[PDB]
Amino acid sequence: PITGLVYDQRMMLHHNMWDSHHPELPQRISRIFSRHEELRLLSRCHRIPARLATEEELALCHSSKHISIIKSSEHMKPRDLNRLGDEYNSIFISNESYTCALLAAGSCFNSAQAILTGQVRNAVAIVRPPGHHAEKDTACGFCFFNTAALTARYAQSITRESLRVLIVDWDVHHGNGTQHIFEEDDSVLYISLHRYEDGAFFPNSEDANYDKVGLGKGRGYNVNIPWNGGKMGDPEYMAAFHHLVMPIAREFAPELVLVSAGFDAARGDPLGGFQVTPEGYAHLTHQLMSLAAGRVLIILEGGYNLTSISESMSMCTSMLLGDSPPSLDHLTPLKTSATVSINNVLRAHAPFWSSLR
Ligand SMILES: CC(C)(C)c1cn(Cc2ccc(C(=O)NNC(=O)C(F)F)s2)nn1
Ligand SMILES: [K+]
Ligand SMILES: [K+]
Ligand SMILES: [Zn+2]
């Protein structure tokens, strides 16, 4: 059983020319990679080559206009970059941003291909910029193209259109883009855990609430787990997996699992305010590995404490490699509002998932 790993240092070239200390740093990915080396995890993986996504592949999820505008940034002058970036919610652009986004996506496609052709069992993709906020027609939240959504459609394109893909988004932020892209789709089950705060937390939309269950044939295939009023950590996430994520996933029977693996819910993150531990992320990963005959791709999203994300993601890879799960700390009583969140979701989804009744 082989675990693949993809990483290319050229994804570091995407940078913030006005604010060089912006938390979506180049070194997010070099740090994670270094920690894999340090722990001797790298040498235990098969290295999967990065490549650029093609414009045709982008069109799996994104409009020509969007692709064209971001493509054009490659040749923009500083003023054009700053103004274009400022047309979006929370975006910075440099001349290398487009190519970096292509590299992130194409890295994940190669990884999905390696999994689906049986060359590896599972894989980790250490990529930036992130993807899950990226919409069909717009950039958002440090994301240009929706890497994970693209990877799902890429997987369908090399297997069959109806290949069942579960996307579990444990980044602390709602994947607005991923929700929307698959909102009318029953082939792609989207499950997101996220800090919501009654819509006050980025990206600040009630779309992230538990009552958005999907539209049309996608009804029941969008699962939002919003957290409110609580510094959520390993007990709340373990409870959500037990009561919601795993029961729904098992019943869906995915053929491929993608993890929108942000590590901004991690203890010490400067933005998330949460306290999931490296060991917590290992248990989450271990649980997902029981799905899809173990066909799991972990895709880096957000996460801004360089130490926290390095420890947390390297622990995930350790789980993929088949190492036994570390012990969790003492699971404090589940926080109250978390029970309330889990109950709301149970009631929203019991109509669609018999395992919930
Ligand atoms: C530069 C500072 C720190 C002032 C700042 C805060 N925010 C708010 C946000 C916009 C987007 C965010 C986010 O989504 N983070 N994690 C992701 O999943 C992303 F990587 F995809 S937090 N903007 N700028
Ligand atoms: K999420
Ligand atoms: K869906
Ligand atoms: Zn995030």
Side-chain angles (χ1 to χ4, degrees):
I2 308 159
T3 296
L5 178 153
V6 62
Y7 168 78
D8 188 318
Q9 64 194 247
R10 286 188 59 75
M11 277 175 290
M12 295 179 68
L13 295 170
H14 170 52
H15 71 278
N16 191 320
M17 60 184 72
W18 270 100
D19 180 10
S20 78
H21 296 275
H22 180 295
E24 201 298 85
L25 284 167
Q27 54 266 46
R28 290 169 69 253
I29 57 168
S30 57
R31 286 288 295 282
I32 290 157
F33 181 75
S34 164
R35 186 70 172 136
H36 282 73
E37 285 191 282
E38 250 166 20
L39 289 168
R40 295 178 186 186
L41 295 167
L42 179 60
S43 63
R44 295 171 64 197
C45 300
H46 175 64
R47 192 62 179 282
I48 295 172
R51 67 174 176 97
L52 301 185
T54 68
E55 292 178 43
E56 172 171 57
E57 287 165 339
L58 296 180
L60 295 167
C61 298
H62 298 286
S63 71
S64 55
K65 187 177 193 218
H66 181 57
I67 296 163
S68 188
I69 298 180
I70 307 308
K71 184 185 176 183
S72 76
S73 72
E74 182 173 5
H75 297 293
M76 277 181 180
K77 302 176 185 164
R79 194 190 68 184
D80 299 317
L81 291 165
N82 300 316
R83 291 176 157 184
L84 171 62
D86 294 345
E87 303 297 352
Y88 305 106
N89 189 346
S90 301
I91 287 286
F92 57 92
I93 323 180
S94 72
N95 282 321
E96 309 96 336
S97 300
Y98 175 65
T99 300
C100 289
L102 295 180
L103 251 187
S107 294
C108 295
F109 301 159
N110 278 1
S111 295
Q113 175 182 61
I115 292 170
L116 291 162
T117 58
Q119 284 171 32
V120 302
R121 179 175 198 66
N122 53 40
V124 69
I126 307 171
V127 298
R128 73 177 288 266
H132 68 153
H133 295 306
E135 295 281 1
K136 180 180 194 297
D137 187 53
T138 206
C140 174
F142 320 150
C143 305
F144 293 96
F145 308 120
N146 192 326
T147 294
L150 287 170
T151 297
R153 292 299 200 216
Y154 171 78
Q156 290 175 338
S157 80
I158 64 162
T159 55
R160 64 168 205 293
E161 294 312 302
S162 62
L163 186 83
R164 292 194 303 290
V165 181
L166 169 65
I167 298 177
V168 177
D169 184 336
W170 74 37
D171 182 289
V172 77
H173 302 92
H174 190 232
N176 49 289
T178 313
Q179 170 169 313
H180 293 151
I181 287 159
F182 299 119
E183 207 169 13
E184 295 182 289
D185 196 343
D186 63 345
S187 61
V188 181
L189 169 57
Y190 180 63
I191 310 185
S192 179
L193 315 95
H194 42 279
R195 182 169 184 200
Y196 180 56
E197 303 301 352
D198 294 322
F201 202 71
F202 189 91
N204 303 106
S205 163
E206 296 194 40
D207 295 350
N209 216 349
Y210 60 81
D211 54 346
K212 317 314 191 268
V213 297
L215 297 168
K217 80 172 187 324
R219 284 188 73 236
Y221 292 82
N222 192 80
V223 178
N224 284 332
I225 311 182
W227 305 122
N228 301 299
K231 185 172 154 52
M232 309 309 190
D234 287 6
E236 294 78 28
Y237 279 70
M238 296 293 133
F241 264 56
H242 183 72
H243 289 128
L244 290 168
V245 181
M246 292 307 298
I248 292 165
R250 273 186 301 253
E251 186 167 359
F252 180 69
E255 291 164 286
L256 180 66
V257 179
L258 306 178
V259 189
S260 271
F263 297 92
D264 42 10
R267 191 174 273 151
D269 192 78
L271 297 180
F274 278 14
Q275 54 183 352
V276 179
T277 68
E279 296 75 18
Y281 287 111
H283 276 256
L284 301 182
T285 302
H286 194 253
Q287 284 180 64
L288 296 180
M289 289 171 57
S290 67
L291 305 168
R295 299 197 289 273
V296 179
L297 174 51
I298 301 170
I299 301 176
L300 182 63
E301 292 280 3
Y304 306 100
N305 183 312
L306 300 170
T307 294
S308 305
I309 73 178
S310 293
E311 190 63 23
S312 298
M313 194 171 207
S314 59
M315 194 89 93
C316 297
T317 302
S318 162
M319 296 300 97
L320 298 182
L321 280 158
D323 300 335
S324 18
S327 320
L328 299 173
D329 221 299
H330 181 83
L331 295 191
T332 62
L334 199 60
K335 290 172 166 48
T336 263
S337 75
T339 294
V340 164
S341 291
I342 289 176
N343 277 342
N344 287 339
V345 173
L346 278 170
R347 274 183 283 291
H349 279 276
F352 311 112
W353 302 98
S354 64
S355 67
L356 261 38
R357 283 153 176 158

